[PDB]
Design a protein around this ligand. Structure first.
Ligand SMILES: Nc1ncnc2[nH]cnc12
Ligand SMILES: [Cl-]
Ligand SMILES: [Cl-]
Length: 153
């Protein structure tokens, strides 16, 4: 259909779902594929090939459920997979206060141009990784501007 409409709906869906999870300290890990493919990491998860919504993203990460333990990977206009493996960064610069989801988000950002969003189950803070860099505990305004810049062409 109309790509700009799809891209803005994707941004809204990430914003609403991460707001919901952040308030409840639900851990989450959502990686959005870009020019470089993520197909090999999609293959490690449970296939969904589903329409993007804030509601599905939230339902996926509910603790102690079949789909929660790993990354969601979004490819084109679909939630491709849940519970996917991402490579862990070995960087010693990542703070030891951060958990596996952050190290996974950092790891995938070091080998793809994907944009990955994390919700910390410890703090509720929202972080983002891109190109081997971490943007830690961003405000709602900051998250919106980054997602606009990176996900809207
Ligand atoms: N908990 C985790 N979530 C996603 N990718 C991972 N790779 C290793 N541990 C992981
Ligand atoms: Cl069209
Ligand atoms: Cl966490």
């Amino acid at each position: 259909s109309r790509i700009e409409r799809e891209q803005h709906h994707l941004i809204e869906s990430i914003e609403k779902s991460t707001q919901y999870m952040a308030k409840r300290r639900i851990g989450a890990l959502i990686s959005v594929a870009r020019d470089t493919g993520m197909d090999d990491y999609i293959e490690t998860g449970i296939p969904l090939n589903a329409k993007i919504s804030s509601q599905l993203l939230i339902n996926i990460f509910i603790p102690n459920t079949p789909l929660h333990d790993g990354a969601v990977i979004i490819k084109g206009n679909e939630i491709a997979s849940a519970a996917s493996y991402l490579p862990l960064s070995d960087s010693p610069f990542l703070s030891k206060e951060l958990g596996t989801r952050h190290r996974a988000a950092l790891g995938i950002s070091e080998v793809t141009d994907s944009i990955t969003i994390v919700v910390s189950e410890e703090t509720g803070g929202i972080s983002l990784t891109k190109g081997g860099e971490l943007f830690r505990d961003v405000s709602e305004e900051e998250l919106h501007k980054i997602l606009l810049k990176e996900l809207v062409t």
